[PDB]
Amino acid sequence: QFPKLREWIGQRVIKDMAAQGYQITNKLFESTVGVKRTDIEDDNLGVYGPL
Amino acid sequence: FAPAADPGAAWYLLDTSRSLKPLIYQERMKPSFTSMTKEDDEQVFMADEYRYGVRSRCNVGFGFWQLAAMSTEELNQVNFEKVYDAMRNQKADGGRPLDIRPNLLVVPTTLRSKAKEVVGVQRLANGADNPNFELVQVLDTAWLN
Amino acid sequence: MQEMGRAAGAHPDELVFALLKAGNANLCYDGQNFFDTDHPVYPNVDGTGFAPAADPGAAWYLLDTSRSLKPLIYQERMKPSFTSMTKEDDEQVFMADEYRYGVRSRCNVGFGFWQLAAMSTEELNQVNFEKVYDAMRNQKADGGRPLDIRPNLLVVPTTLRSKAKEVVGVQRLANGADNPNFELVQVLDTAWLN
Amino acid sequence: EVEGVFVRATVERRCRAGFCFDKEGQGFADGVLSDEQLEALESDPLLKVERCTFSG
Amino acid sequence: EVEGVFVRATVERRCRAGFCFDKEGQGFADGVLSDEQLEALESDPLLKVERCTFSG
Amino acid sequence: AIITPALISALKTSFQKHFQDALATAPSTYLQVATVIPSTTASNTYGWLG
Amino acid sequence: VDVYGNPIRTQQLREPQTSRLAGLAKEFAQHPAKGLTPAKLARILVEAEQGNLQAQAELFMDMEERDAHLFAEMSKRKRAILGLDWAVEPPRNASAAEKADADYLHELLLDLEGLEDLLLDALDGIGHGYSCIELEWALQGREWMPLAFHHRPQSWFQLNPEDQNELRLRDNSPAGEALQPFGWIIHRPRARSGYVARSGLFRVLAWPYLFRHYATSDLAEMLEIYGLPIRLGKYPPGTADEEKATLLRAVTGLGHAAAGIIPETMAIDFQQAAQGSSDPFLAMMRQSEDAISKAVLGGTLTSTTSQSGGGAFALGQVHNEVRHDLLASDARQLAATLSRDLLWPLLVLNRPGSPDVRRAPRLVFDLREQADITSMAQSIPALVNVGLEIPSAWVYDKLGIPQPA
Amino acid sequence: VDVYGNPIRTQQLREPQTSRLAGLAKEFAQHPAKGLTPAKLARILVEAEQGNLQAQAELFMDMEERDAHLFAEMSKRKRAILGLDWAVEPPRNASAAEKADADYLHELLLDLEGLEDLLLDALDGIGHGYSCIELEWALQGREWMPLAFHHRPQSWFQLNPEDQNELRLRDNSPAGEALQPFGWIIHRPRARSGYVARSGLFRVLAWPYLFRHYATSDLAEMLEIYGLPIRLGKYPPGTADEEKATLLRAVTGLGHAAAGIIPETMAIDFQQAAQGSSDPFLAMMRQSEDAISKAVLGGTLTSTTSQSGGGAFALGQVHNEVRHDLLASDARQLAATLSRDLLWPLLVLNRPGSPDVRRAPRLVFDLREQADITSMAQSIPALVNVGLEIPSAWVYDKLGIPQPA
């Protein structure tokens, strides 16, 4: 951000501005479930398929 | 326990997330993997994610509270109002204020009732007063602690 | 450019509240500090001292009146025209200019030097809030007559906003006892001071 | 080498012993060290700036 | 933690003396030393490769 | 795998200019406590006779 | 109130909104086109997408000024609109009061000076994506009048941080300032569907402009180098500095000088300077110019020119496809903007009552296309002798001849 | 209820569906066209096939912006539709009540501002494969009104994991959010038979765009290198660093400088810089542009231009094959979408009863083609004198002349 507007007497100070660059990487996430192919069809109540 | 005072109306939101990729669905159906021909009749279903949070502004977030509501002079007046004063007293480069307006209070389910007492009832815990009524609206959660 | 513009737009508040901070140091037209205990209203002695300022803001003039001389004309140095790019590696300069200054309207219509707190109904609330209130209510002018001041503004730093709201905004003060100053003076936030 | 000196026989703000002065031409432009303190020392060239690298 | 391991009895090109033959050595996906030699030593696998968490 | 992902950080990383100018000054306050007195001189003076 | 329903207060109409922003009037354009590279252009466009329209507006102005072909195309396109006759019509099956209101508005627009300048200023939004014209409101007794129309540079505005389709003034604050109701005529033609920043035609035309600029500059440099060959002199060991300078001056002036003499121990070799042609540069310039012509005026008459060929139906052939479509689109959008911004304040300030917004009069441009009088005049007699009862109103309207009064 | 039969609740019409998704309005396009390679494009398309439409939508927007020829073709195609007159007609052999309903709907559409913008926004689905326009519903007493039409970017949606033809909002959840009934006008033109992801025309046009981009960039680079030749200086052993720098600067400036002198022990060799032509690049650009023209507007008028040539039947020759077919297809699809999405809510909210869906009025675009008046006017008298009783209704309808009233 800019420096505060100061008083003026004889000359102007050519101020500067800082910078605070922030670094952060990325991470990967996963969740998986192993199921039997035959079992999903081998059901009558409509369960083990929506899972 | 697990407190945090955050602004919500600022151009930035604390703890900003990153939905870099969508909730793509990964599946193992049939003649697409070897798990089902040169293996048992196995299928796996997966949800890949490639996201991560961020520590956005550490000069506007405050934590580590003994969050309490009693006596309106020692427990809340000296902790929650202390955080109020600290957040509103934050100074940027050059000594100007950050215009911090604490309006978000996040606490776990254990502190939900006591946060509601801090914000929502005119009297704090003894019939004295509650200076922090309708100043910060609290949203309950359980993902933390 | 836009950052400098917003800084310039904010500047007048900084000027006014810097003068408010210096009020305990700067002098009003009498010849004493704006917030001093020895205002020479008469051969007698009159006094008005976290740098708060109870103000009526209802008379024909308001305290710490601002003086807008020149707007925030943008000053820029982005062309080889100048010797900054000659003597240096293409250094451009961006600037904003102001020609204003704060004012000390009247030191007999303001008060400071507060030991602010809201513990007891009065014994700690009238310590400052009511002392300012009644003092202004009975400030005398030339001719031994009241100024008919109507204090209705209270400016305090951020740290004192909770106490100010308790003083004005709650029926009870800090012990469920009473609060004589409810809906008396409307407080406003500020961080430019302290 | 030295990126820049910006001396012109004038420093930006050389503040010592609680008082801030303007002399000794101690202007630098580099992140070798004391960048946080380099902000305080620099950032105030009241007078003209002349950059003459010393190739240090 | 180190991410990178090959524990499927998998084959990799490790060069002992004048020849490069099957062997499992570094077998990591991160490098801080012996990069030039690791390249020859860390030739990606010939056969099935599966990774684990040594956390060493 | 890749021999040295260490040096390829510069190319990969992207920019999110969301923290840029994510701040503002405090709301204007001199209006409530101070009154504007436009002027065009170098030293304005006020006179009252009591 | 206005068409959008925002409350309207007549107190703020006495002074322009920008009057209290004297800083804006003292600014000068930064000319970002000079020293422009593809990376700089990409950064400018991306930043404009994020709400920094100042650089984009200045770049567009420079682009308009520095390209003669693009400027000619845009000027022709705008002058096409500026030459159209216009009229104000009452709403569908309007009543006597509505007809009177429309007639009064029509009379007011006829006698309002500066209409052509207003249309020209509004049409700038075609290329810039948005044009803002400030209004000066004055009272000549009991009736409000637009004193003048002021066109404000596109560099004076920005995007709302909370809304990418809403423009705001630059008042040094992060959020800018909302536009005053009844204080502006904002024209935002929509060539492509998207946000306001991406809606300008110059955004499409920027890259061909840069290609043409690079090709022209390179051709100019190569023409400068053309002519004499570069020739290098060589000297043996033991040649002093004075002799070196003499040899250098001799080589420097040898191209202009037909003849010269040097010692046998020295040598001058004439090497190729620049050998090639203007074919690649000119090919690139032609490609860019054709792209600009197609993007601005269509690829049937300008780039792939329709060629000559007269006839009764020649007007239709030249116009209806491409030219008529573009003319009608631009005219309709401009008319909608005008009816929204200028007609409505006049109706709701200069007349009593609160007429419903849906029944407001609409400005209409005359898009009538000249119809062949001779062929149709031949055709009618056969049809009427057959027995068809063709209405005379259709004939009078389509021919342009007015009905008898 | 709606046409699809889904229950309709008037409670949810007070607020837009996306109002509770303030996160979407703050997003910025990622511009995936910059630094695009064929592998990246293939990955983008494949991922879009799987339900990640954000990257595809942003790429399509960039493609539209960065190609002048493609943008001109698409704009011309859309403006063709935007200029067509339209009317609302009652169903087959409609009754008096149905005729009144159709008339009221027609009057409502005439007086509804922003219709042209709605049509333009809907036509974006031609290239993007689907366009979604959000509705603002308001009550002016007892009658519901569309307050405004908001076009939402295609990047705001995705595919249902359980259905590849059903779109959903991006609400941070894996399954997204179902589209609110009566809250959107979804236009999904079908150029090719398949799923919604594969249905866009820009999917066909992507590869020619990349070919043209690569050719243009390579030509620009080669034009930059053209001009002076590369020349290499050689120095003998025992040349110090200062002399090396002097030789390097001399070589660097030698191309611009006509003359120079070096010691006989040194040497400068002028090597070919870039020798060839623009023919291959321009050939590739022409091929890509012809492909784009054929894909967008047909290979009879744009790419393989129909050339000049007037006449009474010239209009038919130019239009009927290709141009008329494309115009009719686009107009019919847009009319069907409108009749489904906008007309039906108005009929079922603004009028009493529950009319059957099959009897709803249908919006019709005027596709009438100008017929030669002179030839046919010559023809009728012979036929009528022969004895044929030609109806006058056919004549009035086909000529465009209205029946007497």
Side-chain angles (χ1 to χ4, degrees), chain A, chain B residues 1-39 41-145, chain C residues 1-88 90-194, chain D, chain E, chain F, chain G, chain H:
Chain A
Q1 191 57 257
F2 275 115
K4 215 154 54 171
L5 286 88
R6 67 183 297 280
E7 286 166 318
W8 156 258
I9 310 295
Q11 271 199 268
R12 313 193 188 233
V13 294
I14 314 291
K15 297 184 173 294
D16 63 358
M17 38 176 180
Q20 304 156 5
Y22 176 40
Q23 277 153 73
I24 190 167
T25 191
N26 279 105
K27 293 195 299 141
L28 299 98
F29 309 93
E30 57 82 23
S31 48
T32 184
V33 304
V35 295
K36 323 292 200 65
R37 183 188 49 198
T38 55
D39 273 338
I40 52 158
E41 293 83 3
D42 301 345
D43 58 354
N44 309 83
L45 273 291
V47 183
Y48 182 76
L51 293 175
Chain B
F1 190 85
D6 310 328
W11 292 271
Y12 63 84
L13 265 62
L14 277 180
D15 313 314
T16 180
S17 180
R18 279 219 300 277
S19 198
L20 196 155
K21 76 188 289 186
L23 72 165
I24 62 170
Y25 294 93
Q26 296 295 107
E27 61 276 49
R28 161 169 266 147
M29 301 324 317
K30 72 176 183 291
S32 299
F33 284 129
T34 188
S35 78
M36 331 175 277
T37 299
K38 268 208 308 192
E39 285 203 4
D41 303 289
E42 321 295 0
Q43 311 184 307
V44 308
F45 300 91
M46 180 178 71
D48 270 340
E49 289 292 332
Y50 182 76
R51 314 185 186 173
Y52 188 33
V54 194
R55 302 278 86 193
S56 43
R57 299 291 88 198
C58 47
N59 288 74
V60 62
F62 200 109
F64 200 70
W65 302 357
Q66 69 276 17
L67 188 154
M70 165 152 275
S71 194
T72 189
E73 294 290 328
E74 301 294 313
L75 289 89
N76 184 77
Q77 183 60 78
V78 185
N79 185 3
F80 180 90
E81 313 201 44
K82 182 174 72 68
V83 176
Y84 182 76
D85 291 331
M87 286 197 61
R88 264 151 171 290
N89 278 307
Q90 308 285 45
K91 302 279 161 274
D93 303 324
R96 286 158 300 160
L98 280 298
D99 201 326
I100 306 309
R101 290 297 100 76
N103 67 321
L104 277 296
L105 174 61
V106 66
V107 287
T109 51
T110 177
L111 290 172
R112 193 272 201 287
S113 298
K114 210 178 47 186
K116 272 209 74 157
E117 286 297 89
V118 167
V119 185
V121 54
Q122 282 59 15
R123 324 271 281 291
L124 185 65
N126 61 8
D129 268 327
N130 186 30
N132 311 110
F133 160 77
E134 280 279 285
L135 282 71
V136 168
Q137 65 90 27
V138 70
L139 55 89
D140 190 34
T141 182
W143 278 283
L144 78 167
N145 290 84
Chain C
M1 183 278 288
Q2 68 175 7
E3 280 294 291
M4 187 66 204
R6 60 167 285 290
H11 172 77
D13 284 288
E14 271 86 10
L15 177 60
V16 168
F17 279 103
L19 194 67
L20 186 156
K21 287 167 71 90
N24 285 112
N26 298 151
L27 283 70
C28 60
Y29 73 75
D30 291 331
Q32 283 295 291
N33 289 324
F34 190 80
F35 287 167
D36 213 347
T37 53
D38 63 358
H39 281 312
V41 67
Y42 279 117
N44 311 312
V45 173
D46 166 60
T48 57
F50 275 92
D55 306 326
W60 191 256
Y61 63 80
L62 315 177
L63 289 93
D64 317 310
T65 182
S66 185
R67 207 148 55 89
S68 61
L69 277 296
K70 179 173 76 182
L72 59 84
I73 298 95
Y74 295 93
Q75 285 287 19
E76 322 286 12
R77 274 291 211 81
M78 82 295 277
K79 324 173 311 293
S81 286
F82 308 85
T83 187
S84 191
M85 281 133 287
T86 294
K87 277 281 158 185
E88 312 308 304
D90 297 316
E91 271 146 20
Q92 321 176 320
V93 165
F94 296 72
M95 171 155 98
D97 277 349
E98 294 294 328
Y99 191 30
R100 319 180 185 162
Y101 183 53
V103 191
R104 304 269 86 190
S105 84
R106 199 87 87 194
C107 50
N108 296 68
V109 72
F111 184 77
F113 196 75
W114 285 26
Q115 296 75 10
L116 192 154
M119 277 75 88
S120 64
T121 299
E122 315 206 11
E123 270 277 89
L124 272 295
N125 189 359
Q126 50 165 348
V127 160
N128 68 350
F129 195 92
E130 191 269 336
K131 85 180 171 191
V132 309
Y133 201 69
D134 69 0
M136 311 215 188
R137 295 272 151 163
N138 63 30
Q139 290 292 28
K140 298 293 178 247
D142 54 284
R145 297 193 291 290
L147 286 163
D148 192 7
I149 299 164
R150 198 172 301 142
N152 61 6
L153 301 153
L154 171 59
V155 66
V156 293
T158 55
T159 184
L160 280 173
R161 183 176 176 86
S162 296
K163 285 322 271 183
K165 285 283 280 173
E166 283 291 272
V167 166
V168 190
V170 191
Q171 293 82 17
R172 324 281 161 251
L173 197 74
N175 324 297
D178 273 328
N179 190 358
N181 317 103
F182 180 77
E183 275 284 271
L184 188 151
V185 162
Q186 66 102 7
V187 73
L188 59 84
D189 183 42
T190 308
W192 288 296
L193 78 165
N194 288 95
Chain D
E1 309 288 88
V2 164
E3 177 52 54
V5 299
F6 319 93
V7 174
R8 193 246 176 282
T10 183
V11 76
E12 284 90 356
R13 282 293 184 271
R14 192 82 194 89
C15 205
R16 307 287 290 169
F19 303 121
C20 298
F21 293 100
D22 290 320
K23 43 184 80 69
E24 312 317 302
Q26 197 169 335
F28 292 164
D30 199 349
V32 168
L33 187 59
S34 291
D35 209 32
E36 297 172 354
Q37 201 271 329
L38 190 151
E39 168 55 24
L41 169 55
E42 314 292 305
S43 197
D44 279 314
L46 190 83
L47 276 77
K48 175 62 194 109
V49 177
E50 150 70 359
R51 170 190 57 145
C52 179
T53 62
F54 302 156
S55 66
Chain E
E1 63 280 18
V2 65
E3 57 186 355
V5 175
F6 313 140
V7 289
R8 291 297 88 192
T10 305
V11 173
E12 270 96 343
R13 314 271 91 81
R14 307 312 183 117
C15 318
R16 176 250 195 289
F19 70 95
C20 305
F21 181 75
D22 310 338
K23 183 65 170 189
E24 52 191 359
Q26 183 84 26
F28 296 168
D30 196 349
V32 75
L33 189 145
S34 283
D35 199 57
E36 79 294 9
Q37 194 187 355
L38 273 170
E39 168 58 287
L41 293 167
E42 81 199 347
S43 185
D44 285 330
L46 190 48
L47 272 77
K48 281 197 176 66
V49 73
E50 293 176 350
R51 183 177 292 171
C52 78
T53 316
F54 279 161
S55 66
Chain F
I2 292 280
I3 311 304
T4 52
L7 59 89
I8 198 154
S9 66
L11 283 74
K12 290 191 294 192
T13 179
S14 61
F15 293 97
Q16 302 303 114
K17 301 291 105 173
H18 295 235
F19 292 166
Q20 170 65 1
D21 189 359
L23 281 172
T25 188
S28 66
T29 302
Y30 85 93
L31 283 72
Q32 304 256 320
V33 68
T35 185
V36 186
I37 298 294
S39 57
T40 60
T41 191
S43 45
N44 175 23
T45 61
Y46 316 85
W48 57 103
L49 299 173
Chain G
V1 298
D2 59 337
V3 292
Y4 293 99
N6 298 344
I8 188 71
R9 264 282 297 287
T10 193
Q11 188 275 330
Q12 293 75 12
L13 273 64
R14 179 66 65 192
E15 66 287 19
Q17 170 165 37
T18 56
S19 62
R20 64 201 70 102
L21 268 293
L24 288 169
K26 300 294 187 291
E27 293 179 353
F28 291 120
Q30 272 78 18
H31 289 278
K34 253 286 172 173
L36 186 70
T37 61
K40 289 175 184 181
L41 179 47
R43 289 194 294 274
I44 282 160
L45 297 171
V46 175
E47 275 180 342
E49 274 184 61
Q50 293 179 356
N52 187 80
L53 306 179
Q54 189 192 309
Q56 183 178 265
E58 278 152 347
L59 171 66
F60 289 178
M61 288 166 210
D62 291 331
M63 185 180 288
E64 182 65 26
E65 183 178 1
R66 292 152 70 87
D67 206 292
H69 186 67
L70 184 147
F71 162 81
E73 307 274 323
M74 292 301 315
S75 66
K76 176 194 311 169
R77 195 181 160 170
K78 288 189 278 190
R79 280 193 277 92
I81 301 296
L82 294 175
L84 284 178
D85 262 6
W86 53 263
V88 179
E89 313 278 0
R92 314 203 216 202
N93 56 46
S95 71
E98 293 167 312
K99 293 182 183 293
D101 293 329
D103 268 313
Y104 164 71
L105 278 160
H106 188 76
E107 294 293 328
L108 183 63
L109 282 72
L110 261 67
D111 297 325
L112 182 61
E113 183 178 1
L115 185 68
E116 273 291 327
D117 272 11
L118 168 58
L119 302 188
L120 173 63
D121 293 342
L123 288 162
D124 208 31
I126 293 162
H128 268 251
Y130 66 93
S131 185
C132 318
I133 295 93
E134 202 156 23
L135 283 72
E136 289 265 23
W137 287 103
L139 275 159
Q140 63 87 29
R142 297 279 81 77
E143 294 294 328
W144 269 273
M145 194 72 30
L147 193 64
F149 305 102
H150 290 104
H151 174 251
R152 306 307 198 195
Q154 283 78 352
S155 60
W156 283 17
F157 306 85
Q158 53 156 42
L159 296 179
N160 199 359
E162 293 83 3
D163 205 335
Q164 317 203 359
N165 261 315
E166 190 276 331
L167 296 156
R168 293 169 100 69
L169 273 295
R170 288 176 33 237
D171 66 349
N172 296 115
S173 78
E177 173 159 353
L179 276 73
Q180 183 178 2
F182 278 22
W184 303 85
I185 302 190
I186 315 295
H187 188 45
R188 289 148 62 156
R190 295 258 301 290
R192 271 90 168 171
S193 175
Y195 286 130
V196 65
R198 299 270 277 280
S199 61
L201 180 68
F202 291 146
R203 278 190 67 104
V204 180
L205 304 177
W207 298 109
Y209 156 85
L210 197 62
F211 282 118
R212 205 171 98 71
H213 177 81
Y214 266 67
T216 299
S217 285
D218 293 316
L219 177 53
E221 294 186 58
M222 182 179 72
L223 286 190
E224 201 168 6
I225 190 167
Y226 279 166
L228 278 296
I230 294 89
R231 73 281 190 191
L232 184 85
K234 292 177 71 68
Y235 54 90
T239 308
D241 272 297
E242 289 77 17
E243 207 160 4
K244 281 178 193 139
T246 303
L247 175 59
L248 176 55
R249 68 180 65 252
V251 182
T252 307
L254 185 45
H256 294 323
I261 54 163
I262 54 165
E264 69 275 16
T265 58
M266 301 196 173
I268 301 176
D269 295 331
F270 298 75
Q271 163 178 75
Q272 296 177 357
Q275 297 307 136
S277 309
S278 65
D279 293 80
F281 304 101
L282 271 291
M284 183 52 95
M285 314 187 187
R286 293 181 184 271
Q287 183 66 41
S288 298
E289 274 169 17
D290 291 331
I292 279 157
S293 282
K294 293 187 286 185
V296 180
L297 302 182
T300 66
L301 179 53
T302 63
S303 71
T304 60
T305 313
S306 69
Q307 300 300 108
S308 179
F313 192 44
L315 272 290
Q317 292 171 43
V318 171
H319 189 194
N320 193 359
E321 65 270 19
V322 184
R323 298 294 296 163
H324 183 272
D325 307 270
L326 196 45
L327 184 56
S329 178
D330 284 304
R332 285 192 269 88
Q333 293 212 78
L334 188 60
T337 298
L338 289 174
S339 304
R340 214 186 305 113
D341 291 331
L342 190 45
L343 276 291
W344 183 246
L346 295 166
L347 188 75
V348 302
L349 287 163
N350 298 20
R351 283 300 191 87
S354 290
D356 193 3
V357 65
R358 185 72 189 182
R359 307 293 297 166
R362 282 171 319 286
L363 188 153
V364 176
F365 277 101
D366 200 350
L367 275 292
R368 182 257 178 184
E369 184 170 357
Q370 184 272 328
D372 309 284
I373 297 95
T374 312
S375 68
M376 198 269 307
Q378 284 152 293
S379 67
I380 284 158
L383 300 170
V384 299
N385 296 115
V386 161
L388 271 291
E389 168 46 55
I390 196 78
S392 82
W394 171 78
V395 182
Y396 295 132
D397 296 327
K398 182 266 289 179
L399 277 296
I401 306 305
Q403 62 89 53
Chain H
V1 298
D2 59 337
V3 292
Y4 293 99
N6 298 344
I8 188 71
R9 264 282 297 287
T10 193
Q11 188 274 330
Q12 293 75 12
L13 273 63
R14 179 66 65 192
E15 66 287 19
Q17 170 165 37
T18 56
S19 62
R20 64 201 69 102
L21 268 293
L24 288 169
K26 300 294 187 291
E27 293 179 353
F28 291 120
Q30 273 78 18
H31 290 278
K34 253 286 172 173
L36 186 70
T37 61
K40 289 175 184 181
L41 179 47
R43 289 194 294 275
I44 281 160
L45 297 171
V46 175
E47 275 180 342
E49 274 184 61
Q50 293 179 356
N52 187 80
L53 306 179
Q54 189 192 309
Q56 183 178 265
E58 278 152 347
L59 171 66
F60 289 178
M61 288 166 210
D62 291 331
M63 185 180 288
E64 182 65 26
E65 183 178 1
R66 292 152 70 87
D67 206 292
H69 186 67
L70 184 147
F71 162 81
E73 307 274 323
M74 292 301 315
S75 66
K76 176 194 311 169
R77 195 181 160 170
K78 288 189 278 190
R79 280 192 277 93
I81 301 296
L82 294 175
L84 285 178
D85 262 6
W86 54 263
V88 179
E89 313 278 0
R92 314 203 216 202
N93 56 46
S95 71
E98 293 167 312
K99 293 182 183 293
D101 293 329
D103 268 313
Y104 164 71
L105 278 160
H106 188 76
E107 294 293 328
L108 183 63
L109 282 71
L110 261 66
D111 297 325
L112 183 61
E113 183 178 1
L115 185 68
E116 273 291 327
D117 272 11
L118 168 58
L119 302 188
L120 173 63
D121 293 342
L123 288 162
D124 208 31
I126 293 162
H128 268 251
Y130 66 93
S131 185
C132 318
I133 295 93
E134 202 156 23
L135 283 72
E136 289 266 23
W137 287 103
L139 275 159
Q140 63 87 29
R142 297 279 81 77
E143 294 294 328
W144 269 273
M145 194 72 30
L147 193 64
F149 305 102
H150 290 104
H151 174 251
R152 306 307 198 195
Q154 283 78 352
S155 60
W156 283 17
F157 306 86
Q158 53 156 42
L159 296 179
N160 199 359
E162 293 82 3
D163 205 335
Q164 317 202 359
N165 261 315
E166 190 276 331
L167 296 156
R168 293 169 100 69
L169 273 295
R170 288 176 33 237
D171 66 349
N172 296 115
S173 78
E177 173 159 354
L179 276 73
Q180 183 178 2
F182 278 22
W184 303 85
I185 302 190
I186 315 295
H187 188 45
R188 289 148 61 156
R190 295 258 301 290
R192 271 90 168 171
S193 175
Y195 285 130
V196 65
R198 299 270 277 280
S199 61
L201 180 68
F202 291 146
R203 278 190 67 104
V204 180
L205 304 177
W207 298 109
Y209 156 84
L210 197 61
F211 282 118
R212 205 171 99 71
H213 177 81
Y214 266 67
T216 299
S217 285
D218 293 316
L219 177 53
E221 294 186 58
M222 182 179 72
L223 286 190
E224 201 168 6
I225 190 167
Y226 279 167
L228 278 296
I230 294 89
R231 73 281 191 191
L232 184 85
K234 292 177 71 68
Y235 54 90
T239 308
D241 272 297
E242 289 77 17
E243 207 160 4
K244 281 178 193 139
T246 302
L247 175 59
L248 176 55
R249 68 180 65 252
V251 182
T252 307
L254 185 45
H256 294 322
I261 54 163
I262 54 165
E264 69 275 16
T265 58
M266 301 196 172
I268 301 176
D269 295 331
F270 298 75
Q271 163 178 75
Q272 296 177 357
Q275 297 307 136
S277 309
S278 65
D279 293 80
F281 304 101
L282 271 291
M284 183 52 95
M285 314 187 187
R286 293 181 184 271
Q287 183 66 41
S288 298
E289 274 169 17
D290 291 331
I292 279 157
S293 282
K294 293 187 286 185
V296 180
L297 302 182
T300 66
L301 179 53
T302 63
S303 71
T304 60
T305 313
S306 69
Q307 300 300 108
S308 179
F313 192 44
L315 272 291
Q317 292 171 43
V318 171
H319 189 194
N320 193 359
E321 65 270 19
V322 184
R323 298 294 296 163
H324 183 272
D325 307 270
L326 196 45
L327 184 56
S329 178
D330 284 304
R332 285 192 269 88
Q333 293 212 78
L334 188 60
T337 298
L338 289 174
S339 304
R340 214 186 305 113
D341 291 331
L342 190 45
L343 276 291
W344 183 246
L346 295 166
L347 188 75
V348 302
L349 287 163
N350 298 20
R351 283 300 191 87
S354 290
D356 193 3
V357 65
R358 185 72 189 182
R359 307 293 297 166
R362 282 171 319 286
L363 188 153
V364 176
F365 277 101
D366 200 350
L367 275 292
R368 182 257 178 184
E369 184 170 357
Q370 184 272 328
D372 309 284
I373 297 95
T374 312
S375 68
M376 198 269 307
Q378 284 152 293
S379 67
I380 284 158
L383 300 170
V384 299
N385 296 115
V386 161
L388 271 291
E389 168 46 55
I390 196 78
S392 82
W394 171 78
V395 182
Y396 295 132
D397 296 327
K398 182 266 289 179
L399 277 296
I401 306 305
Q403 62 89 53

